[PDB]
Design a protein around this nucleic acid. Structure first.
Ligand SMILES: [Mg+2]
Length: 1202
RNA sequence: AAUUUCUACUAAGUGUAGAUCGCAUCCAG
DNA sequence: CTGGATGCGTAAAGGACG
DNA sequence: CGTCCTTTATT
């Protein structure tokens, strides 16, 4: 009984193995003399070119077929599409109609005579040259005759367009699922908005745009859709909506603009047309220090056009008073928070002064319709914002001082940069070497980018009642010039942040269009590439075109050394292969196949479905079984051993046995003397398939991919991992010069970087070079493998994880959470919620031999954040930090995998589509998304390198506890062993009681502060404890639906940390507050006395004292020692929860700090969901919904503690 | 600071530890 | 540019060409 | 013929 070991051999998946290919002997010499690499480097260039010309014809072919087309179902479909109350049968109707619509478009394409030619040899030899009218381009296409097969891959990518399936890549799908669906929505909107378009306004568009061949109304009748299948039609349709610009240049207004005026001017909100997407084929970064520099000077010198539009926006905003403050608007969003702060000094005072009208009891259904109508508003006028501005304070004047301040900042930064704009300037050093220069370009770009990103607030997305077009005329003119800095900012950053070496490579073919197609022994002379072994070394051996068969003559050499030559036999895809061979002109003539059998095949009775006869299919199988035996190229390759034919449920049952039997990999001896001569003579080329684990100097643990690669040829690997074909060989030209490499000169000591390494220094007898691998041309070889090609353990992984979980008695849960002090914190939990382990992942501990050496990745991040502060916020340090986090998580994966294996444990992770990230946490959402993706990926085939490959857990019996990754949005609910959970109420919650603080203690009014103090059942001093007790029933406060217990007794126990920061003893600070106002707190219930008091500074000291008692988390920033979590509520046994009582302990039973509490409670939510699985019938486990609500959660946390 | 590649390294001396699905294509803001 | 999605990860029939 | 490039078959 293990959950894990039920999950081996579940599904098949592809991986690519990558290797340096090192030439051997004369190989590189012979390759240089024959000038082969040049030919390839050119070919790749020319190939990209021809693909574009090919596309040109493809694009012409598509318009021909789309123009012609006339869709049949249309009206009928649109109508059913529109029905808002469809019986399920009617939704199936609607699908069949949508399928038929797509099949119409597909059949329109594939039914040409022209179609089969597009992806055959013919398109390059004859069609494209006739089509083209340039002599150069025709020469390019001509260069590829006898090399058509190299286009197959591209051909497959273009085929996806002509599909009828509902797939992103399809033309049908783009027409029927995306563009038709929009057209229909626009019809809907049109009949609502039809009348407002002025009689005159419409006739404009029919002449200026439509050219008087169709009426504007035509474009909103269903039956007229066919017109907008083509990119041309779409260009028209979108022009009607967006507006056009004629040959003359006269602006012509579009329907969507007219609507904008009407809804603006009458303070209304009618809807607007969506434009149609483009059709599927219709129509880069900076490459050198000089090009980057040149752009910086040309777009941003003092007489560039962007600088001109700054000078104009200075004059416009200097004249801010001269304009109407009721027709100037500020878009709603982040810019409202910012501009609120800029002029009041307060983020949420502008929030308040429209809360001043809207604002007293708060049911959350009224609080959402509160908080939502809020978000509905589009913008605010300078008049409305002055309606909020207390008298004596001019909103327009202080805005003028802020905007004008930002342009003086730009001009000041221009004078510090002036020498970069001299026509006389030349660059001393490379930019990545020249920090001075880049920081000069950054500083200017920033100040321009902040001015730009600030000013952008003055839009209002309007859609806006009468706008000061005297202001927006000059503003829009000049802002559209200013927004060009955006592109220029990105591309110049992306450049400085790039690496100094390039990975640019190109594909080698060795003059063979199907080069290295597959490893099959028979196809070995066609592909001209095979694999050799000698001892622990593996080589790629490539026959030269003029000596294809040169390896076929070589015999085993008894006396001398021998190579091992691979002997590989694959039957690829019996469902594809078995028919082609046995119904081929060649074989069909040899083997009379009865009219039954060809009927069965032509008819399709063997294929499951309604046409299926188990007997017909059974007869086809014995046809295939005899032919295979009459076909000795298979029957003698694979010792075939089929199941008795009566036992097959379907054809796929037989095929699956062929597929698994039809793979064999062995080795043959081949004379090492004879093969080496071939290489010298230039008849064979030889590369060692190499990575660092094959070095004579390597010791200790190989890369996982080395192990996979070796296991391919191991006799304990029985198909678990197949060597696939379609490997590629590439040359990556060097991108660095040895002389310009950083060298650590031999025999001088080098300073070690890791503070936790005892050894502070290493001295080597040899030189070591930074980025050495890129100072040299490198061959790289990519080998695709096939894991679990024939899976036996077929079941839906999640349903199986739910069954095992339900019937598992003590299910363990690894909870992972992101901390502020801790990059990641781990809490392992048992089936009853006892903390088994709990620790931080700030330090990664690497083990080699019996030694351990830890690397504190929290120290590393802290030092790279300091280095970010020094040198402003340099572009690169941001990247270094991004990459460092990116590598951190790949250490963490290993640890999580260990925990899974050790505890047979499910994983509880944060759902990143629902929750809200606090940004106190170091590992931002983006990086964590990457981590959850990596985790899914590893667990498709989770292996322990250090295990025996044949053991479960090993490289041949990898655990498959995760379904193949799809999309970030799909990282929700559950994926096998990984459960995604909302982080709500996982941190700030008493792990000992389930208590959370559902009170709002923000002070507003003296009256509000009274109703609060009266809503408590009791407020008293307790002398025998020296504590103030605040008994409540959450019934009496608003927004407390989620709590389950409801009646709590708060105490002012222990201290808190107010936020600079002061420690506050709670008990004595209440005494202090009450004594300040002559309140006798010892007199039983005190609630009347506090409400008797009439001083507002009493209530705000009290609400602040309530805030502190309910702030369970207390933290001092920079002080990693002080992250304590302390409860105001007593548990079953009348003890308060204080986290520090457990951080002390070595094996604690409750969370040791705030971060620990986070992880713990995320793992408990999974425990709740396992609770649900145990409540459900086995058959209905699929149906159980995992998403735990706040209401369900608080119930679980408040009842499970006991 | 060496790498199929990436991060962290120097890990006891040309390397250590973990990770590592390639290639092509299309579509989106 | 980076996530979304597509597809290939093949031996053997078949043909052009000298 | 041979040899090299192209095309084929799909649960
Ligand atoms: Mg290693």
């Amino acid at each position: 009984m293990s959950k894990l070991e039920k999950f081996t051999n579940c599904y098949s998946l592809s991986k690519t193995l990558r290797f340096k290919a090192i030439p051997v002997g004369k190989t590189q010499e012979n390759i240089d003399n024959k000038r082969l690499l040049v030919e390839d480097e050119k070919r790749a260039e020319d190939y990209k070119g021809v693909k574009k010309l090919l596309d040109r014809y493809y694009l012409s072919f598509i318009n021909d077929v789309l123009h012609s087309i006339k869709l049949k179902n249309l009206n009928n479909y649109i109508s059913l599409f529109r029905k808002k109350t469809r019986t399920e049968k009617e939704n199936k109707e609607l699908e069949n109609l949508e399928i038929n619509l797509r099949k119409e478009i597909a059949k329109a394409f594939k039914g040409n005579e022209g179609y089969k030619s597009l992806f055959k040899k013919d398109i390059i030899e004859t069609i494209l040259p006739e089509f083209l009218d340039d002599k150069d381009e025709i020469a390019l296409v001509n260069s590829f005759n006898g090399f058509t097969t190299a286009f197959t891959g591209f051909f497959d990518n273009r085929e996806n367009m002509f599909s009828e399936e509902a797939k992103s890549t399809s033309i049908a799908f783009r027409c029927i699922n995306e563009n038709l669906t929009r057209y229909i929505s626009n019809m809907d909107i049109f009949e609502k908005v039809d009348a407002i378009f002025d009689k005159h306004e419409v006739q404009e568009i029919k002449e200026k745009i439509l050219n008087s061949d169709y009426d504007v109304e035509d474009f909103f009748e269903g039956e007229f859709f066919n017109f907008v299948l083509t990119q041309e039609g779409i260009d028209v349709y979108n022009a009607i909506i967006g507006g056009f610009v004629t040959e003359s240049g006269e602006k012509i207004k579009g329907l969507n603009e007219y609507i904008n005026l009407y809804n603006q001017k009458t303070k209304q909100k009618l809807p607007k047309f969506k434009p149609l997407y483009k059709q599927v084929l219709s129509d880069e970064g900076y490459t050198s220090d000089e090009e980057v520099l040149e752009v910086f000077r040309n777009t941003l010198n003092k007489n560039s056009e962007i600088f001109s539009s700054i000078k104009k926006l200075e004059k416009l905003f200097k004249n801010f008073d001269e304009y109407s403050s009721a027709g100037i608007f500020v878009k709603n969003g982040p810019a409202i928070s910012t501009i609120s702060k800029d002029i009041f000094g307060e983020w949420n005072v502008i929030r308040d002064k429209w809360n001043a009208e809207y604002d007293a009891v708060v049911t959350e259904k009224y609080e959402d319709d509160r908080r939502k109508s809020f978000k509905k508003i589009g913008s605010f006028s300078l008049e409305q914002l002055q309606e909020y501005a207390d008298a004596d304070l001019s909103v327009v004047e202080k805005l003028k001082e802020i905007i004008i301040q930002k342009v003086d900042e730009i001009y000041k930064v221009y004078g510090s940069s002036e020498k970069l704009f001299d026509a006389d300037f030349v660059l001393e050093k490379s930019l990545k070497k020249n920090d001075a220069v880049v920081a000069i370009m950054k500083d200017l770009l920033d100040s321009v980018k902040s001015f730009e990103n600030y000013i952008k607030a003055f839009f209002g997305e309007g859609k806006e009642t009468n706008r000061d077009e005297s202001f927006y005329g000059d503003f829009v003119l000049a802002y559209d010039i200013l927004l060009k800095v955006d592109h220029i900012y990105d591309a110049i950053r992306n450049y400085v942040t790039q690496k100094p070496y390039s990975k640019d490579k190109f594909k080698l073919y060795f003059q063979n269009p199907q080069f290295m197609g597959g490893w099959d022994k028979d196809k070995e002379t066609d592909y001209r590439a095979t694999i050799l072994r000698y001892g622990s070394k593996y080589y790629l051996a490539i026959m030269d075109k003029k000596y294809a068969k040169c390896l076929q003559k070589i015999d085993k050499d008894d006396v001398n050394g021998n190579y091992e030559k691979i002997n590989y036999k694959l039957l690829p895809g019996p469902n594809k292969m078995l028919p082609k061979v046995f119904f081929s002109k060649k074989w069909m003539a040899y083997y009379n196949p009865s009219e039954d059998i060809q009927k069965i095949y032509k008819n399709g009775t063997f294929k499951k479905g309604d046409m299926f006869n188990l007997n017909d299919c059974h007869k086809l199988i014995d046809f295939f079984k005899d032919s295979i035996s009459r076909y000795p190229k298979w029957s003698n390759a694979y010792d075939f051993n089929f199941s008795e034919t009566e036992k097959y449920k379907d054809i796929a049952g037989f095929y699956r046995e062929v597929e698994e039997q039809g793979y064999k990999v062995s080795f043959e001896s081949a004379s090492k003397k004879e093969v080496d001569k071939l290489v010298e003579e230039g008849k064979l080329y030889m590369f060692q398939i190499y990575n660092k684990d094959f070095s004579d100097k390597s010791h200790g643990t190989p890369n996982l991919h080395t192990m996979y690669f070796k296991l391919l040829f191991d006799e304990n690997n029985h198909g678990q991992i197949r060597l696939s074909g379609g490997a590629e060989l590439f040359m990556r030209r060097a991108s660095l010069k040895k002389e310009e490499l950083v060298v650590h000169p031999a025999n001088s000591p080098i300073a070690n970087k890791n503070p936790d390494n005892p050894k502070k220094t290493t001295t080597l007898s040899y030189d070591v070079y930074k980025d050495k691998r890129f100072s040299e041309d490198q061959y790289e070889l990519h080998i695709p493998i096939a894991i679990n090609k024939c899976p036996k353990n077929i079941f839906k992984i999640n349903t199986e994880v739910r069954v095992l979980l339900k019937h598992d008695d003590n299910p363990y849960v690894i909870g992972i959470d992101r901390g502020e002090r801790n990059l990641l914190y781990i809490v392992v939990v048992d089936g009853k919620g006892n903390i088994v382990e709990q620790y931080s992942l700030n330090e990664i501990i690497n083990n080699f031999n019996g030694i351990r050496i830890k690397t504190d990745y929290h120290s590393l991040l802290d030092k790279k954040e300091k280095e970010r502060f020094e040198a402003r916020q340099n572009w690169t340090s941001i990247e270094n930090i991004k990459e460092l986090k990116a590598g951190y998580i790949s250490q963490v994966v290993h640890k999580i995998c260990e925990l899974v294996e050790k505890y047979d444990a499910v994983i509880a992770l944060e759902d990143l589509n629902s929750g809200f990230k606090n940004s106190r946490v170091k590992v931002e959402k983006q990086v964590y998304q990457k981590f959850e993706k990596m985790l899914i990926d590893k667990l498709n085939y989770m292996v322990d390198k250090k295990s025996n490959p044949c053991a479960t857990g090993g490289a041949l019996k990898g655990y498959q506890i995760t379904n193949k990754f799809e999309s970030f949005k799909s990282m929700s609910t559950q994926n096998g062993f990984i459960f995604y959970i909302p982080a709500w109420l996982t941190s700030k919650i008493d792990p000992s009681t389930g208590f959370v603080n559902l009170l709002k203690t923000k002070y507003t009014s003296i009256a509000d502060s009274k109703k609060f103090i009266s809503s408590f059942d009791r407020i008293m001093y307790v002398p025998e404890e020296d504590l103030f007790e605040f008994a409540l029933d959450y019934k009496n406060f608003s927004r407390t639906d989620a709590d389950y217990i409801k009646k709590w007794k708060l105490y002012s126990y222990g201290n808190r940390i107010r936020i600079d920061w002061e420690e506050v003893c709670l008990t004595s600070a209440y005494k202090e507050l009450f004594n300040k106002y002559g309140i006798n707190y010892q007199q039983g219930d005190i609630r009347a006395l506090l409400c008797e008091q009439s001083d507002k500074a009493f209530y705000s000291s009290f609400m602040a004292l309530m805030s502190l008692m309910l702030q369970m988390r207390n933290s001092i920033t920079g002080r990693t020692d002080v992250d304590f979590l302390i409860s105001p509520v007593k548990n079953s046994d009348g003890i308060f929860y204080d986290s520090r009582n457990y951080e002390a302990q070595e094996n604690a039973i409750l969370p040791k700090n705030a971060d620990a509490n986070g992880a713990y409670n995320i793992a408990r939510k999974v425990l709740w969901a396992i609770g649900q699985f145990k409540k459900a019938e086995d058959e209905k486990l699929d149906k159980v919904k995992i998403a735990i609500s706040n209401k369900e959660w608080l119930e679980y946390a408040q009842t499970s503690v006991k």
